[PDB]
Design a protein around this nucleic acid. Structure first.
Ligand SMILES: [Mg+2]
Ligand SMILES: [Zn+2]
Ligand SMILES: [Zn+2]
Ligand SMILES: [Zn+2]
Ligand SMILES: [Zn+2]
Ligand SMILES: [Zn+2]
Lengths: 505, 131
RNA sequence: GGGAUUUUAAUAGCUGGCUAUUAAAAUCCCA
């Protein structure tokens, strides 16, 4: 009505407005034509066609609500559910110069996958017959801080090529993770302006070759496809957008990121900014706050994986309880006080930081309780403590391995998603300085009902032979242990452990 | 620098039109759902004594029509996106568009929903008689 | 070069106050 906006600003250097038949709005009409009642009079003064005026794309607001059309600027709670779709996104731009002044065009796009795309300076030019999206004269931002952007002015590629490269990178990243793309931006204005160059929106669509949700659009074919069928597609379809600065952060991106993380140090480039933005989002959502009610759907083998961790944990706990004649066990991090094995009878105690049942103690571990817990074994199954005591059984995820259920996290940690999402601190070999890596073994004690193994604790192996039942059980536990080890978990034990003591029974 | 062109209130719909695959369906679904139609159109002062054709080089509105600047009642010129026409030339820009008086609530939507006649150059159903 | 908040100057409008546009000053974010 009366508030003007910087969107579609006439960035031309012309001193006068346009004629009524050529001007797009009433505001852009030159005043010589206007009258008192907000109408325009077709004056006999000739028009100044042909012309070319650069039009600004700064100011997009995707806040309209239309039925059938999805909401693409999601909240925090919806972004947490879409955590597998998170791709960091930075844009560094160039100022329009020469013919125009008053808009910025994208120059380098950076993504959290470590990829940078350099583009030719392209803007919208309004002409007396319509409009084009064509290359315009530009200039790197002045000052020392942007001196690295000077070579990029002579290295850009065409936008239709960079579009397909972006779609192919997104397809290679998000094929096995999600059907959606969520751009995690820090200042979403220029990011959305540059996202207008390679993204399309609309109603939700189905892939043309399968049943998955469509995530890319093909203009030459006018078709929609998912990440598996997006070969040759040139547009991203219905991406989500997240503005981290709107989550309550004061200052710039670098001081907010470096407050919590010291892993993502590097030179100034858009990919580094994107990585820092996604890392700050991960810290904001999974370290500062804990939801614990949001469940995520399974992807590849979560159920079988959890079954294998339970089997491996039962075996190692039973063997460690039998060897060394330990009579006491402290389980730190137990959510509900669930014992693992009870055939070797030992005393049990349970601790946690956020217990789900009053039977479990509220505790944080800082090595000061090593003298408190010196009379028994300490179990640290998926319990993250920077320094483990002398006599313990510890299982820890190696965050240096990334998979479908393990995403990069904050300060070297990793977000492990299986039903619930847990942020794990970085794997450190120095944390296990009082422990040793567990060798592979299998302990069987059930009665029997060709295979050779030198680490199979078995009464048949005591007799120098092997039976079919124990062989099948050993091979099944081999599959279980191999799945556990390949998934990323590593086992650490007290120093005095040796499987020869298991020959006692 | 530069000179502003559009109001803030329109910035919600035009941005939508800048991103959608089908801008015409996007605008019509936005307006039909109850959204505010585009404002800030170049509406001219006419003597209301014209021939009443749809698109003309000069204002030609009759008593039951209002003349608008052609580049203002085109969705693609307002959103500054590519035109669907052959060779990319707008058929409204540089000319004047006559809108029926009972449709001045949304001139852009009227121009998106209606097309002029090939033979007589009047709006189909609003002055065209070729039966 | 783009924008947000506060203040000021000019212009226009409304009923001593206010609103909008343009410009200027400060702080912050973005390039
Ligand atoms: Mg940046
Ligand atoms: Zn598909
Ligand atoms: Zn970081
Ligand atoms: Zn046997
Ligand atoms: Zn047009
Ligand atoms: Zn006709």
């Amino acid at each position: 009505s009366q508030i003007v906006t910087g969107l579609f600003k006439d960035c031309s250097r012309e001193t006068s407005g346009l004629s009524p038949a050529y001007a797009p709005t009433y505001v852009s009409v030159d005043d010589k034509y206007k009258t008192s009642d907000e109408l325009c009079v077709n004056l006999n003064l000739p028009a100044n066609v042909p012309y070319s005026r650069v039009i600004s794309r700064m100011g997009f607001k995707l806040d309209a609500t239309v039925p059938g059309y999805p909401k693409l600027f999601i909240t925090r709670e919806e972004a947490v559910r879409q955590v597998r779709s998170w791709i960091g996104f930075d844009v560094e731009g160039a100022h329009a110069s020469r013919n125009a002044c008053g808009t910025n065009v994208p120059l380098q796009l950076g993504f959290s996958t470590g990829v940078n795309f350099v583009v030719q300076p392209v803007g919208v030019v309004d002409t007396e017959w319509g409009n084009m999206l064509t290359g315009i004269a530009a200039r790197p931002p002045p000052g020392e801080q942007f001196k690295h952007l000077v070579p990029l002015m002579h290295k850009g590629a065409a936008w239709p090529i960079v579009r397909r490269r972006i779609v192919q990178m997104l397809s290679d990243t998000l094929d096995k993770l999600s059907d959606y793309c969520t751009f995690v931006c820090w200042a979403h204005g220029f990011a959305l302006t540059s996202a207008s160059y390679f993204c399309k929106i609309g109603k939700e669509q189905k892939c043309c070759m399968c049943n998955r949700r469509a995530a890319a659009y093909s203009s030459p074919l006018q078709s929609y496809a998912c990440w598996t069928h997006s070969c040759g597609y040139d547009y991203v379809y219905n991406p989500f957008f997240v503005d981290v600065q709107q989550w309550g952060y004061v200052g710039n991106l670098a001081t907010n990121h470096d407050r919590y993380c010291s892993v993502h140090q590097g030179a100034h480039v858009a990919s580094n900014d994107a990585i820092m933005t996604r890392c700050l989002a991960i810290h904001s959502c999974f370290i500062e706050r804990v939801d614990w009610d949001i469940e995520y759907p399974y992807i590849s083998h979560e159920k079988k994986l959890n079954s294998c961790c339970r089997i491996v944990e039962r075996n190692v706990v039973r063997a460690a309880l039998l060897a060394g004649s330990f009579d006491k066990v402290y389980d730190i991090g137990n959510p509900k006080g669930i014992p693992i094995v009870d055939d070797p009878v030992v005393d049990w105690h349970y601790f946690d930081a956020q217990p789900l049942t009053r039977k479990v103690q509220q505790l944080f571990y800082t090595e000061d309780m090593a003298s408190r817990f010196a009379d028994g074994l300490c179990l640290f199954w998926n319990c993250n403590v920077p320094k483990y005591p002398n006599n313990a059984i510890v299982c820890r995820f190696d965050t240096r391995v990334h998979s479908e259920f393990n995403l990069p996290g904050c300060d070297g940690g990793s977000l492990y998603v299986n039903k619930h999402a847990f942020h794990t601190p970085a794997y450190d070999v120095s944390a296990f300085r009082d422990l040793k890596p567990l060798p592979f073994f299998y302990y069987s004690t059930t009665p029997c009902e060709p295979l050779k193994s030198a680490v199979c604790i078995t009464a048949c192996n005591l007799g120098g032979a092997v039976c079919r039942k124990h062989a099948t059980e050993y091979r099944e536990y081999m599959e279980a242990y191999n799945l556990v080890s390949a998934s990323g978990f590593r086992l650490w034990c007290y120093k005095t452990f040796d499987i020869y003591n298991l020959w006692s029974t | 620098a530069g000179s502003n062109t559009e109001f803030a209130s329109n910035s919600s719909v035009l941005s939508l039109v800048n991103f959608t695959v089908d801008p015409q369906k996007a605008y019509l679904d936005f307006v039909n759902a109850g959204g505010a139609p585009l404002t800030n159109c170049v509406k001219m002062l006419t003597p209301k004594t014209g021939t009443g054709i749809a698109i003309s080089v000069k204002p030609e509105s009759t008593a039951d029509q209002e003349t608008y600047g052609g580049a203002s009642v085109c969705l693609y010129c307002r959103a500054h996106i590519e035109h669907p026409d052959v060779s990319g030339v707008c058929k409204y820009k540089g000319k004047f568009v006559q809108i029926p008086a009972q449709c001045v609530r949304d001139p852009v939507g009227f121009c998106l929903s209606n097309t002029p006649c090939n033979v007589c150059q009047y709006w189909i159903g609003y002055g065209c008689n070729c039966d």
